[PDB]
Design a protein around this nucleic acid. Structure first.
Length: 75
DNA sequence: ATGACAGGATGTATATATCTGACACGTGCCTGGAGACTAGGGAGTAATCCCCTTGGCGGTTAAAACGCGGGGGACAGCGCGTACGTGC
């Protein structure tokens, strides 16, 4: 069970906060380094990485959907 | 932060002297090309026929075709670990 993976993905994206945002590749490598499965739950991450762009907590920098770069909200 | 505009420096191209050997030219020769004639055969030509290709006629559906849909594909966007590219 454990906590839902939204908190895990927020820790993964808040770990670095590069000026050019994290790729989907680098964030799933961070989640795999954390230990969360990224191979069978990649549909769950696939929907989560656009749900988080949609709800406004995180904004997408340069890519589209779950592609490209990502950064935190202004406030 | 990003793109627009100038400049140098050395590598590559630009202009000029050298030499050399290899393009090029000159010579021996004998092989090579071929004239006459022939032997003899391949091959062009007539013809014909027949059968195998061309031409046509009726019925099926196999195939073509057309269209709606749906889920698969194609390929860009961007990042990132990387993997040679490159100086020495």
């Amino acid at each position: 069970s454990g906590p839902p993976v939204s908190e895990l993905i927020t820790k993964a994206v808040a770990a670095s906060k590069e000026r050019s945002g994290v790729s989907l590749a680098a964030l799933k490598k961070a989640l795999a380094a954390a230990g969360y499965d990224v191979e069978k739950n990649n549909s769950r991450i696939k929907l989560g990485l656009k749900s988080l762009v949609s709800k406004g907590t995180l904004v997408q920098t340069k890519g589209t959907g779950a592609s490209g770069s990502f950064k935190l909200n202004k406030k």
